[PDB]
Design a binder for this molecule. Structure first.
Ligand SMILES: Nc1nc2c(ncn2[C@@H]2O[C@H](COP(=O)(O)O)[C@@H](O)[C@H]2O)c(=O)[nH]1
Ligand SMILES: Nc1nc2c(ncn2[C@@H]2O[C@H](COP(=O)(O)O)[C@@H](O)[C@H]2O)c(=O)[nH]1
Lengths: 117, 118
């Protein structure tokens, strides 16, 4: 329903990916171009293009993204050392794929949140 | 775990200017803003790190994000865009041990991860 991105094909197993977790609400898969030793994308199974499009009924799935992140971080061996979760929205955020998603990043000291400040 | 200063802010035990508060989440401006919009969105319950979340927290965690969308719209940054960031433990650079999202926006934010080396 509505404009699907390549992430729709990934969740619905219509194109190859490395899925590390999937339930009725979320799917998590390794990033094709990892920016840290662990770089995993966590996405809701429904098509919400940007964070601007979220609604109350999505809250359980949005929360599931974060509990799944914690589960995966532990599996990956990065939970104790630490990690960052990032959601990018629109131009200023640098969003490239218009299906909301969280990046789980870890495996080394990740430095400042933003370049310079 | 012990409560941080965020708990005193949430329960209005010290002066503050709260941007948003409901049953589950509280939002306010960062003391040291890193972007023209820099707002923290925090669950009302103390959860020290993201490692400590569980199923019972999912509603509140989801609420963080729907509240972020509301605040981004109010701030005039929703169209241009913004980032939401949660930092956990050392490698993430967490300083305050009560989980929270940073809503950052109001200008192009640059690389998602600036420092990929030292
Ligand atoms: N696994 C996988 N990752 C993808 C694919 N296409 C884009 N990506 C990843 O999706 C992410 C998009 O993040 P954004 O810049 O929108 O926050 C990028 O890190 C990019 O590497 C794909 O087909 N498969
Ligand atoms: N408004 C406000 N922000 C604070 C206070 N103490 C710490 N902060 C902010 O809390 C944030 C902690 O984020 P962390 O480093 O844990 O991801 C920092 O950006 C810091 O500037 C405070 O008393 N008031």
């Amino acid at each position: 329903m509505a404009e699907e991105t390549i992430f729709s094909k990934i969740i619905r197993r219509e194109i190859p990916s490395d899925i590390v977790y999937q339930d009725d609400l979320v799917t998590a898969f390794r990033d094709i171009s990892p920016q840290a030793p662990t770089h995993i994308l966590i996405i809701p199974n429904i098509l919400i293009p940007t964070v601007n499009d979220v609604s109350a009924e999505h809250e359980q799935a949005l929360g599931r993204m974060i509990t799944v992140a914690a589960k995966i971080a532990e599996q990956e061996g990065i939970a104790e050392d630490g990690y960052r979760l990032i959601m990018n929205t629109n131009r200023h955020g640098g969003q490239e794929v218009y299906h909301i998603h969280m990046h789980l990043l870890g495996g080394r000291p990740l430095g400042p949140m933003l370049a310079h400040k």
